[PDB]
Ligand binder design. Structure first.
Ligand SMILES: [Zn+2]
Ligand SMILES: [Zn+2]
Ligand SMILES: [Zn+2]
Lengths: 49, 144, 125, 24, 96, 170, 147
């Protein structure tokens, strides 16, 4: 997650998913998914300065 | 609500709570500790043809929470199982005051020509797979 | 012989051989009147140890509490509570949830799970 | 014999392995 | 807390969805009765309802008081987003 | 009065009934012999059947387990004394001789648990607002019908439960 | 009726191209695994759960009829068509379908049969969890499950 926000991982395709109930970490980089930007919130505060 | 017990299609699978396959050599002296004095005090049963029956025991368990919800007894279950498959099927149970409702089933060996009398390398029915067919046919076809 | 004891004789899951690595089928020896186990591909045989070899109609005990690990508190998508008296140590910020399965569990009682290090336990209130 | 004994085994499945090795 | 008495005829989860049905129904009907007495006969909005057209008592609360429950196929809103409905809410939240 | 018989099967069943009363050591303080009362119970069962069949052996099994229950000492002491007659003990109409102590309280809540099943059902309705003009009571309900329709205006239909009455709100 | 009386525990999946339905445990015999210890490892990595055993126990009986790996390669190609009475030609067809046709995304090489066996076990274990009582049903209208 830290390297994804430092212009090292393509955020327009690579998606990271962590699940605990199924213990399955799925990562899909194929075409067909719809993504959109969001405001990252860190420590119940807006990261945007 | 008394007529509801006769009209509702109460399946036999819902009544039975658990079913296990045990290995009981001596029928009078079983290996189960909690169900030892029940199969021993019963002596009026003609135990003359039970020495060459099927040693494999198929003990079923009846749910007590289902008895109080559908209003059923223990004398109406043994009289129906023996009247479905045939007379070559033994049935026994205990009172509804112990720790759980159990029911043991056995076979009725004629002790005459049921032991390789005519050889015939075909094998009628193996004793290990004989109880699996009845266990899966009584919980669906037989209806109280 | 009283309605108080539970039923847990110890059902064996599966046994492995030492030559074929297959599940052994139960059989009976009429020469010794005992219980033995053998397969079909080989001729390996061994003595028994118990009697319960089959079970039918599962799902009766509390199954939603098991089949889960203590890593459910690392997900920040779960709310916290103010319960601090624990059964091991004493830490607040416990995680509570239902069951989330097929039957979803008829009991709506919450399952308090702590998040403090050095624990690995689970209970209910 | 894998093509002659398989069709008859799935039809009824009432046999034992002791009768197959003895014939061979 | 494992102390609620379920309704005889259903389970425990089917009882919770039934107890909250009469709470939200009485909540949207009590507030609508208070708005009926506030509007006088001079208001032209009530004249459209008293005349008998495409408008009744339920249409007044949905624009001033409260709309109500938006059920789907009779049943309530199911779960299709990891036992939730929207990511804006927390898990295990049965809020109205 | 101890009845006697000549059948071989009947003489064996009377001896097994005496062993059920021995468990507990209750016949010593009362004074009744287990052999005399054991023959009176088997005689009452054979009087109604008068035949040796599988059903005759089912009734005997239901009477031995009721006497071997160590959790109900008061149920067995009532037969050895003079509270419960020996012939009436095997004439049914009692629903399994095994209550008292704590079992009697379980049977009371058993019939009450299934009785309340047909009381609340799945719903309720009944808002109790409209007044019926046929039985001077307010047993009317509402029906949120007609949302858009066509040119017909919407109207909440009011159908009274009792006495069978219905009309329109507008 | 009177044979096995346990048809409900069967699986008989519908493999591509294949006419009728064939069991899935026969494929494990062709992947180079002739023991129940290795096949159970592909399904779940923790066999210490007695609840997950009663579902796979009746399915293990269908594997004792075919023990040799060469025999499992013939049963698959025999149901596709009928190239006469030569059993040798039916082996080559089952070799290319298992690699190039069956699961092409995991690899179509010859040495990929080892990696392909572990991928099939996870698919079987996931279906058994929802068919027993430990997993819900997947939604079809879920946009995350579509492209
Ligand atoms: Zn073996
Ligand atoms: Zn803790
Ligand atoms: Zn009326």
């Amino acid at each position: 997650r830290k390297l994804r926000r430092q212009m090292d991982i393509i955020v327009s395709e690579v998606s990271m998913i962590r699940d605990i109930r199924e213990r399955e970490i799925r990562i899909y980089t194929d075409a067909g998914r719809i993504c959109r930007p969001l405001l990252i919130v860190e420590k119940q505060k807006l990261l945007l300065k | 609500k008394d007529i509801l017990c006769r009209l509702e299609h109460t399946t036999l699978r819902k009544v039975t709570a658990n079913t296990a396959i045990y290995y009981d050599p001596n029928p009078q002296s079983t290996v189960v500790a909690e169900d030892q004095e029940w199969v021993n005090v019963y002596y009026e049963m003609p135990d003359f043809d039970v020495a060459r029956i099927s040693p494999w025991l198929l003990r079923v368990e009846l749910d007590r929470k289902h008895m109080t919800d559908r209003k059923l007894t223990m004398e109406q279950i043994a009289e129906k199982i023996n009247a479905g498959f045939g007379d070559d099927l033994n049935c026994i149970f205990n009172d509804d005051n112990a720790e759980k409702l159990v029911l043991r089933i056995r076979i009725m060996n004629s002790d005459e020509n049921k032991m390789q009398e005519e050889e015939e390398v075909v094998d009628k029915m193996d004793d290990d797979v004989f109880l699996r067919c009845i266990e899966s046919n009584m919980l669906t076809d037989m209806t109280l | 012989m009283e309605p108080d004891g539970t039923y847990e004789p110890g059902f064996v899951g599966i046994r492995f051989c030492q030559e074929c690595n297959n599940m052994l089928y139960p059989k009976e020896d009429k020469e010794n009147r005992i219980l033995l186990y053998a397969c079909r591909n080989c001729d390996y045989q061994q003595e028994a140890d118990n009697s319960c070899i089959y079970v039918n109609k599962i799902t009766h005990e509390v199954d939603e509490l098991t089949q889960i690990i203590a890593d459910v508190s690392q997900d920040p998508t779960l709310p916290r509570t103010e319960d601090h008296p624990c059964q091991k140590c004493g830490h607040k910020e416990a995680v509570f949830f239902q069951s989330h399965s097929a039957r979803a569990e008829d009991a709506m009682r919450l399952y308090y799970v702590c998040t403090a290090p050095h624990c690995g336990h689970r209970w209910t209130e | 014999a894998e093509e002659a004994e398989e069709e008859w085994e799935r039809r009824n499945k009432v046999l034992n392995h002791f009768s197959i090795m003895q014939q061979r | 807390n494992n102390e609620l008495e379920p309704t005889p005829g259903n389970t425990l989860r089917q009882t919770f969805e039934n107890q909250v049905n009469r709470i939200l129904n009485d909540a949207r009907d009590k507030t609508g009765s208070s708005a009926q007495k506030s509007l006088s006969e001079y208001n032209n909005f009530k004249s459209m309802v008293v005349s008998g057209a495409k408008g009744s008592k339920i249409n007044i609360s949905q624009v001033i008081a409260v709309v109500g429950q938006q059920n789907v196929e009779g049943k309530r809103i199911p779960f299709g987003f990891k036992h939730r409905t929207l990511p804006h809410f927390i898990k295990d939240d049965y809020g109205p | 009065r101890a009845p006697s018989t000549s059948d071989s099967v009947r003489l064996k069943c009377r001896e097994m009934l005496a062993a059920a009363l021995r468990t507990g050591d209750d016949y010593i303080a009362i004074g009744a012999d287990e052999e005399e009362l054991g023959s009176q119970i088997e005689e009452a069962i054979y009087q109604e059947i008068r035949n040796t069949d599988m059903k005759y052996k089912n009734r005997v099994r239901s009477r031995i387990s009721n006497l071997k229950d160590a959790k109900n000492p008061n149920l067995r002491k009532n037969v050895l004394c003079g509270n419960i007659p020996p012939d009436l003990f095997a004439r049914m109409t009692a629903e399994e001789m095994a209550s008292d102590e704590l079992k009697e309280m379980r049977k009371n809540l058993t019939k009450e648990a299934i009785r309340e099943h047909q009381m609340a059902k799945t719903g309720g309705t009944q808002t109790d607002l409209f007044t019926c003009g046929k039985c001077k009571k307010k047993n009317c309900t509402y029906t949120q019908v007609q949302t858009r329709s066509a040119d017909e205006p919407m109207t909440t239909f009011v159908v009274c439960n009792e006495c069978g009455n219905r009309w329109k709100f507008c | 009726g009177a044979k096995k009386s346990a048809i409900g525990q069967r699986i008989v999946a519908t493999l591509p191209y294949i006419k009728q339905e064939v069991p899935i445990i026969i494929v494990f015999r062709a992947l180079g695994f002739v023991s129940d210890r290795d096949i159970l490892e592909h399904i779940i990595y923790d066999f210490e759960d007695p609840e997950m055993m009663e579902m796979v126990k009746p399915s293990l009986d269908e594997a004792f009829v075919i023990q040799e790996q060469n025999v499992a390669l013939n049963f698959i190609g025999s149901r596709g068509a009928k190239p006469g009475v030569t059993k040798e030609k039916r082996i080559k067809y089952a070799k290319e379908v298992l690699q190039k046709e069956m699961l092409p995304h995991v690899g179509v090489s010859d040495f990929c049969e080892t990696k392909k066996a572990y991928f099939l076990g996870y698919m079987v274990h996931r279906l058994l969890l929802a068919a027993l009582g430990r997993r819900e049903l997947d939604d079809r209208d879920h946009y995350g499950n579509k492209r």
